[PDB]
Design a protein around this ligand. Sequence first.
Ligand SMILES: Cc1ncc(COP(=O)(O)O)c(C=O)c1O
Ligand SMILES: Cc1ncc(COP(=O)(O)O)c(C=O)c1O
Lengths: 321, 321
Amino acid sequence: ASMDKVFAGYAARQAILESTETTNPFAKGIAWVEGELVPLAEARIPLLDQGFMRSDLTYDVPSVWDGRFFRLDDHITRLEASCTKLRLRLPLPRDQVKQILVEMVAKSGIRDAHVCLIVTRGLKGVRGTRPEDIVNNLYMFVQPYVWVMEPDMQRVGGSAVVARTVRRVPPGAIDPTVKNLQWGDLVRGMFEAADRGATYPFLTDGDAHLTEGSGFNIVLVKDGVLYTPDRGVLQGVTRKSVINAAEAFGIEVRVEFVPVELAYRCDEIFMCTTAGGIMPITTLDGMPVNGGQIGPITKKIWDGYWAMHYDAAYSFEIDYN
Amino acid sequence: ASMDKVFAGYAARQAILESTETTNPFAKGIAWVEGELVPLAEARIPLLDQGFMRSDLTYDVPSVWDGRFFRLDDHITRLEASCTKLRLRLPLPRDQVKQILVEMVAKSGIRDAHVCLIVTRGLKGVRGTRPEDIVNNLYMFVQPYVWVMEPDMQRVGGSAVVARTVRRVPPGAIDPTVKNLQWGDLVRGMFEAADRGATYPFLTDGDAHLTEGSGFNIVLVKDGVLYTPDRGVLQGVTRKSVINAAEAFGIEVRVEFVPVELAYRCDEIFMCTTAGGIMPITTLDGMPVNGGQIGPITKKIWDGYWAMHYDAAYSFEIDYN
Ligand SMILES: Cc1ncc(COP(=O)(O)O)c(C=O)c1O
Ligand SMILES: Cc1ncc(COP(=O)(O)O)c(C=O)c1O
């Protein structure tokens, strides 16, 4: 049980960061706009950027934990794959982007962070001018680590519903493997969950199978096997990490079509995402999940995920001086 | 045939406007941000606005022609309806908003313009925040009139394809009656049309029926009757004007499910939108539409639409002094 150790470390680092605020203007976050570094709350973008006027963009969000970047290359590679699918190009060389990110994290002093990169079409749409001519825009920022499930809730588990008033945008309309900020269905899902007295929405494909939630992938546990949707979802880096850990532990993972009915007969449920890690679900549609306690396989995955944050194969330490 | 006089009047007013670009800092557009007026190219918004970070917003675009606002009340009413659907509230009273828009157009000096109003959730998302704490943001701007089809192309008609690599987002994922900037499918359709040697994409509902395109509604003409999709599309104010004109002329309009097959067997096709008006389509999937000339019913609708811009029931004159 690593929860106590992981969360006590975070609480201690948070107190040190809070002490810095009156002396460090970047302690609450730092942004890169047009090559200049500014405090996050002061960052501004042009109103006419097509990332605002058509959400014509992609983004990605690696993280820093205890001063160690977690799987940064995997996130940059995914960002480049998303850009390719949208006919965008990352505006700076990949090695230069990584040094800028490390430099931003060091200036902020933040040890537990989310690091967001956004690539937009730019100030003009393609139809007026030839594509090579158009100029894509890049925005980057570092912020204190964000929780889809707060630490004290991970100790108990959260409540979820299978959404009935909304379903996930299908891949032949918007490709969910392209990480994006067009959250119309996901925001509807969050309002529905609150209306029904629960915290998290699980969205279907509108054809009796599960996809993904408002900012996380979904994993079901049944008879010692993990199940998680293949089509219709982001290929999450936390999900990839869950697969690495399960394979090291000898637990089978099936990435395939997951019927909605399995969610009502399984042994454990958890969500996974970079903004929070491994997040247990213990009631679904108001009913306890197999008794309502956090399950043994969820616990083993939770411990294994956080151990990977100190493994040289998945992380590297930032020099803050 | 009013095309000659409508287009020649626009050309004359445009020549006057462009002559003033070095003396009038607002001749290329004016924006309202946090109560301050600025040139449109200088307008900036906070990077953390949820209208950018989640496209959590709705927008509406009323127009000014020849110094006359067209159907402004209808646009404001639609924007209020979209806000109610998204649980957003317009920040200022409607009468105040109309007064600001008139002041901005008068300051700009622009006779022909598109006026854009955007309402966003705000700096913070609802979760973890007081409902009182949440504060919706308002952005407004006036820009020179935008043409989805330029005047010279309207004289001959444009080229369209029925999209095969993308379909429209369905209403149970994102409600298309809520005017929005989540254009992922619409942008895919624009790239597909260009790849196929055409300009305009017509998107299906992914169930063998037509919806709308990348910024316009779709109207088919067959045996003296107009057909236009009911479900899955924005309820356009130009489409409403088309219906008014058809009824005055004794032409039947059916607002209903429109099978994809009718597009290959109809007598005329046109698109309609506030950014351009009535836009004929004379090539579809590389084939002439019924001989390839602009049809007679399209021509009557074209003339009737522009005549409404001088009818006091649908328009009012702006005081530029
Ligand atoms: C829609 C969606 N699905 C899944 C995820 C989880 O992806 P990752 O583990 O790479 O953060 C996210 C993360 O933000 C997300 O927004
Ligand atoms: C998606 C979409 N459909 C239809 C329309 C036409 O609506 P209106 O005639 O009200 O401008 C627009 C206009 O911008 C649009 O963006």
